[PDB]
Structure 1
Amino acid sequence: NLAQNEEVSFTLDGDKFFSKHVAVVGSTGSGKSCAVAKILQNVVGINDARNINKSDKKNSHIIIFDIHSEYKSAFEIDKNEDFNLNYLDVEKLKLPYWLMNSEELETLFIESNEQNSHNQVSQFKRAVVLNKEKYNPEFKKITYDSPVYFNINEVFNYIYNLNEEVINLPKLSNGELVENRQIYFNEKLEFTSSNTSKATKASNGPFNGEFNRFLSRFETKLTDKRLEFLLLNQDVEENSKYRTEHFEDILKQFMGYLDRSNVSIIDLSGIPFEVLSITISLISRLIFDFAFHYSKLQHQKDELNDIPFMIVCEEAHNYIPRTGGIEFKAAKKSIERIAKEGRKYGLSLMVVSQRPSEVSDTILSQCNNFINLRLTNINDQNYIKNLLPDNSRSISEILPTLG
């Protein structure tokens, strides 16, 4: 209802509002979360804690990137009204680590708080691609960026075979002269000493004595409970139940199609600050790929997307900052991917934030609708007023005077 007159009903053009990006910024105390929740209940069909869409389930799609777990009650209703919510907390989230491109894998495993040693990134890359090839023989082209299943434990055991003491033709001190190195992944293995010689050379490995602390940090990662949502600890059966043929199931639970939930909250409260960007980028990349393939498949029949996706980004000033370090590179890349393109393939981003003066302009300059609440910071006011397509003596004077 209009602020000036409470009897007149105020309405917009819905087809021109959600189909394009919207920026939602403001300040604490003005109910910015209040406005977001009201718009969300209006669009999904929550009215007076009751679902209008009882008999039939409307095709409303929403995925939310939550960092507080302060939006669950915005859609948690009594069960009798049949409005299910796909609550994806840190515990229930299942994101395989083998659908993960080169940069993300390297940043997750290889990158450390120190300076890396030579011939470490290359060796790990070779181990991962070789294990991908070994586990997936059916697939023709297997590369470092190929999303195919592999075991991180086998790669660790390969790096655990740092201790080569018998070769600088194979000379391995397993059995007598074992040739194939594929047994490296199966077991940790034990070799003999260097105080011996034969027809060939029996001295230290070319990589000998250079991965030691890399094994220390790496195995520390392999036994991390906070990172349990990557299915990293593959020893347990449930972590190994998901395979290349199971890429289907892990993606339904993002779309909520496993439980036909119109709203899919992805609660990222327990995600470590070191792996948050990788998670955001992976989810964004897979959503964009799904939308791209889905749209391109339907061009043959001469119609566009049937299931549009709507993504909201709770305080996105963190992972797409205006200025920042290398921590949030992949998240920025993926959010830019869905920002610049996604109108063609059926994707819309309603980014929400508290500080719009600290969010990257490469994503803020593309929202065709804005709902800004009360502002207290002057640079916030100036930046918002400059970004707004229409501001003529009536929009530039109201931002601080809001209630």
Structure 2
Amino acid sequence: NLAQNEEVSFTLDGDKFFSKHVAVVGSTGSGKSCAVAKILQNVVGINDARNINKSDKKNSHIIIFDIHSEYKSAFEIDKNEDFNLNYLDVEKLKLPYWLMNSEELETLFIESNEQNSHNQVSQFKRAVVLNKEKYNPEFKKITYDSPVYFNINEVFNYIYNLNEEVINKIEGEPSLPKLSNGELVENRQIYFNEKLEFTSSNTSKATKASNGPFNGEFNRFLSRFETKLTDKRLEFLLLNQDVEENSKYRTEHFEDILKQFMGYLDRSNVSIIDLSGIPFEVLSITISLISRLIFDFAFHYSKLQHQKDELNDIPFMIVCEEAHNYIPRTGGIEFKAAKKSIERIAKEGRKYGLSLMVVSQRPSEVSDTILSQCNNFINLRLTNINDQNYIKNLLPDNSRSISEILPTLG
């Protein structure tokens, strides 16, 4: 209802508001979470803890990215009312890390902070192609986004051999690595099965040998890697398992992950993805994959509907909660993968049925490449001149009469 006249109702067009990008910015202790909850509750159809559509199920789809919880309680309606909620705790969600793996795990698997990447990826690529080609005849690279499975333990037995191997250098023999007994390694395909013992390097022609290309150069790095293989805080990205009791995903169980994030396993309309349990500076690992899978599905589903003159029938909305924790303005390299998928959705999501809601309370720290794509603004109270200036430099209407009402709003 209108503030000045409570006898007049306020209505907004739904095809112009929810079909484009929206931004919700406010101050501390103003009612931001309450407003978002009220809007989403009106969208789904909950009124006074009652489900209006008890006999019929409607076609609404919303995904929420939570980093402080605070939103499950808003959808815990009574069991009598037919309303299922899809709550996923990522810390116990079992996300595979081999589907994309380009900017999530291999970013910290063969490189951590050093320029030694120039020789860190020279033989691991060949071994991983060997494994993923022996499983099935295909082609792979160091970066590869296809949903395929490889055994990390085997392929990094090769990496352990890299600093636990000495190449033979005896005159009159082929340049093939010499084992402890004296066997010459014809092909390095036996390395990833299990690490082998090689004789020490020597200059005498009887047992002449030279240290391998990456011998002794990365002992600390592989120590860190094998530490992370059993880290007590990374069980959710199938890392503490490393091919164990839960490894029965060969090539054709990719549908389960999509049905889990989308919520097509129990007929749910709201999905919550909680990132509170996950430690810091490892949360951008999964965003780049969750944001990519939905976009790929939307694109590929939209393509296979123009042969019969139709359009997409399952639009989606994504609700970010704190955009300054993983999409900052002044940043370096620790936030790279997410800031590309979000850009793709913000620049190519209107023709494929995908929108965005950006919620924050410090607008002066969010990337302008994403916040300038928004068409509708809901402004709460603001008391900082920097935020006021930044907002009034982006609003479609910048009349002064409407800018003096911000720090007078209850």
Identify if the C-alpha distance between structure 1 residues 189 and 310 changes in structure 2 by more than 3 Å, giving closer, same or farther.
Answer: same
How much has 1:62 moved relative to structure 2? 0.6
SS at match of 1:105: coil
SS at match of 1:280: helix
Identify if the C-alpha distance between structure 1 residues 239 and 113 changes in structure 2 by more than 3 Å, giving closer, same or farther.
Answer: farther
How much has 1:362 moved relative to structure 2? 0.3
Contact 1:62 1:310 in 2 (8 A): yes
Contact 1:152 1:234 in 2 (8 A): no
Which stretch shifts more, 1-10 or 340-349? 1-10
Identify if the C-alpha distance between structure 1 residues 395 and 238 changes in structure 2 by more than 3 Å, giving closer, same or farther.
Answer: farther
Contact 1:66 1:266 in 2 (8 A): yes
Identify if the C-alpha distance between structure 1 residues 313 and 238 changes in structure 2 by more than 3 Å, giving closer, same or farther.
Answer: farther
SS at match of 1:172: coil
Q: What residue in structure 2 maps to residue 354 of structure 1?
A: 361
SS at match of 1:352: strand
How much has 1:236 moved relative to structure 2? 5.2
Unaligned runs of 5+ in 1: none
Identify if the C-alpha distance between structure 1 residues 402 and 238 changes in structure 2 by more than 3 Å, giving closer, same or farther.
Answer: farther
What do residues 47-69 of structure 1 show as CA deviations (whole Å, max 9, x unaligned)? 11111121111111011111001
Contact 2:22 2:377 in 1 (8 A): yes
Contact 1:85 1:264 in 2 (8 A): yes
How much has 1:134 moved relative to structure 2? 3.0
Residues of 2 paired with 1:201 and 1:285: CA distance? Answer: 51
Identify if the C-alpha distance between structure 1 residues 83 and 118 changes in structure 2 by more than 3 Å, giving closer, same or farther.
Answer: same
Tell whether 2:185 aligns with 1:186: no
Residues of 1 paired with 2:160 and 2:66: CA distance? Answer: 38
Percent identity between the two aligned chains: 100
Identify if the C-alpha distance between structure 1 residues 165 and 368 changes in structure 2 by more than 3 Å, giving closer, same or farther.
Answer: closer
How much has 1:202 moved relative to structure 2? 3.6
What do residues 61-105 of structure 1 show as CA deviations (whole Å, max 9, x unaligned)? 011111001111111122221211111112332321111253434
Residues of 2 paired with 1:325 and 1:97: CA distance? Answer: 24
Identify if the C-alpha distance between structure 1 residues 122 and 202 changes in structure 2 by more than 3 Å, giving closer, same or farther.
Answer: closer
Contact 2:92 2:235 in 1 (8 A): no
How much has 1:141 moved relative to structure 2? 9.0
Contact 1:163 1:191 in 2 (8 A): no
Which stretch shifts more, 102-111 or 337-346? 102-111
Which stretch shifts more, 294-303 or 165-174? 165-174
How much has 1:138 moved relative to structure 2? 5.6
Contact 2:95 2:237 in 1 (8 A): yes
Identify if the C-alpha distance between structure 1 residues 239 and 166 changes in structure 2 by more than 3 Å, giving closer, same or farther.
Answer: same
TM-score, length basis structure 1: 0.92
How much has 1:18 moved relative to structure 2? 0.7
**Which structure has more helix as a fraction of its residues?**
1
Aligned length: 403
SS at match of 1:106: coil
Which stretch shifts more, 172-181 or 214-223? 172-181
Contact 1:128 1:155 in 2 (8 A): yes
How much has 1:159 moved relative to structure 2? 0.8
TM-score, length basis structure 2: 0.91
Which stretch shifts more, 330-339 or 229-238? 229-238
Contact 2:127 2:192 in 1 (8 A): no
Contact 1:227 1:272 in 2 (8 A): no
Residues of 1 paired with 2:315 and 2:261: CA distance? Answer: 14
What do residues 253-306 of structure 1 show as CA deviations (whole Å, max 9, x unaligned)? 110111111000000112232221121111111111111111111111111110
What do residues 177-236 of structure 1 show as CA deviations (whole Å, max 9, x unaligned)? 442322222223333444697788544323221121121111111112322221123445
Superposed CA RMSD in Å reads 2.4
Identify if the C-alpha distance between structure 1 residues 198 and 385 changes in structure 2 by more than 3 Å, giving closer, same or farther.
Answer: same
Identify if the C-alpha distance between structure 1 residues 178 and 114 changes in structure 2 by more than 3 Å, giving closer, same or farther.
Answer: closer
How much has 1:108 moved relative to structure 2? 2.9
